[PDB]
């Protein structure tokens, strides 16, 4: 609750212009790059896995491996 | 014809018969062994010599006795030994040796069952060698 609890929409352009400067994307990577809290990521990454820039590497659970669009 | 394979206490009995590429493991196919990480440990004695390499044989294995990993190693040894025996008997021993060379040069107990059996535990401590904690004072 210390940071990025439920909304993170005052800077809602950073759900779009976030891919550059890091090629990786993960549940930990999102909470690491000072943007979002891990209380929503497991379903927030699903939006972009279904339609977006991130391609899954495997069928991982309890983990995340996504790569940028080539 | 029939072979067996063991790792610690599991035994996997394989029947190799003339047929059309049917590889059953528990009634399910070899693709559904479900260690989910040792699923490529059961493809070793096939991928090794030739990736497909075989539409003439049918391997029906049934494994009972150990644990998940022990039974996966048991089936991966049983299919290997079944292939070796079938080639030795029916196809030719030249080719059985030519695939035994690959099996032994990748040996992961495929042809020879591992000898490591559970060493008996001795009184005065959990485990065979580990002893209970002692206090002097």
């Amino acid at each position: 609750a210390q940071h990025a609890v439920i909304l993170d929409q005052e800077k809602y352009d950073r759900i779009l212009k976030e891919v550059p400067t890091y090629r990786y994307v993960s549940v930990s990577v999102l909470v690491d790059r000072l943007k979002i809290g891990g209380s929503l990521a497991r379903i927030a990454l699903r939006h972009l896995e279904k339609e977006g820039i991130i391609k899954p590497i495997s069928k991982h659970s309890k983990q995340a491996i996504y790569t940028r669009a080539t | 014809v029939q072979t067996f394979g063991k790792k610690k206490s599991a035994t996997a009995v394989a029947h190799v018969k003339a047929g059309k590429g049917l590889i059953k493991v528990n009634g399910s196919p070899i693709t559904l062994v479900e260690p989910e990480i040792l699923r490529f440990k059961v493809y070793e004695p096939l991928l090794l010599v030739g990736l497909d390499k075989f539409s003439n044989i049918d391997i029906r294995v049934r494994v009972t006795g150990g644990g998940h990993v022990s039974q996966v190693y048991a089936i991966r040894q049983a299919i290997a030994k079944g292939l070796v025996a079938y080639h030795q008997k029916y196809v030719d021993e030249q080719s059985k040796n030519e695939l035994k060379k690959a099996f032994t040069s990748y040996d992961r107990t495929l042809l020879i069952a591992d000898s490591r059996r559970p060493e008996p535990k001795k009184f005065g401590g959990k485990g065979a060698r580990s002893r209970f904690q002692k206090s002097y004072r």
Partner: protein, 145 residues
């Protein structure tokens, strides 16, 4: 999962049934902060009230809160089994209750005070501050302060 922008329709730590509730936690385990409801009781009542347990109190509702509270206050009438209640056959009426207030402490101290007024061994032990459920006192729970 969906649009949760909700510029002014978010709720911070909030007010419910004598206890402040952290609206940043899923409703069941957040509500477990009320003294008298735990994990399973909160899960049962919140899946009876047909509220979504996958959300936090900051967005859930403003009336389902008091609805769930009333379900807690009248558990046996809203089709909840009797064995699911923490206080059954209370001491003098046979009914089955569930204390959810700054009242479980008062009911416990009332049980203790009657157990001391009766001059029972359990009451005497609670008076002396020692363990009461047949524990061994020779080695454990020495300082307790």
């Amino acid at each position: 999962s969906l649009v949760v922008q909700e510029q002014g329709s978010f709720q911070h730590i909030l007010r419910l049934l004598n206890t402040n509730v952290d609206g940043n936690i899923k409703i069941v385990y957040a509500l477990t902060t009320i003294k008298g409801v735990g994990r399973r009781y909160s899960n049962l009542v919140c899946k009876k009230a047909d509220v979504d347990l996958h959300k936090r109190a900051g967005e859930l509702t403003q009336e389902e809160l008091e609805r769930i509270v009333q379900i807690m206050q009248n558990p046996t009438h809203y089709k909840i089994p009797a064995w699911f209640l923490n206080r059954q056959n209370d001491i003098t009426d046979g009914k089955d209750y569930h204390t959810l207030a700054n009242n479980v402490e008062s009911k416990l101290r009332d049980d203790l005070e009657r157990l001391k007024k009766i001059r029972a061994h359990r009451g005497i032990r609670h008076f002396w501050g020692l363990r009461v459920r047949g524990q061994h006192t020779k080695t454990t729970g020495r300082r307790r302060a």
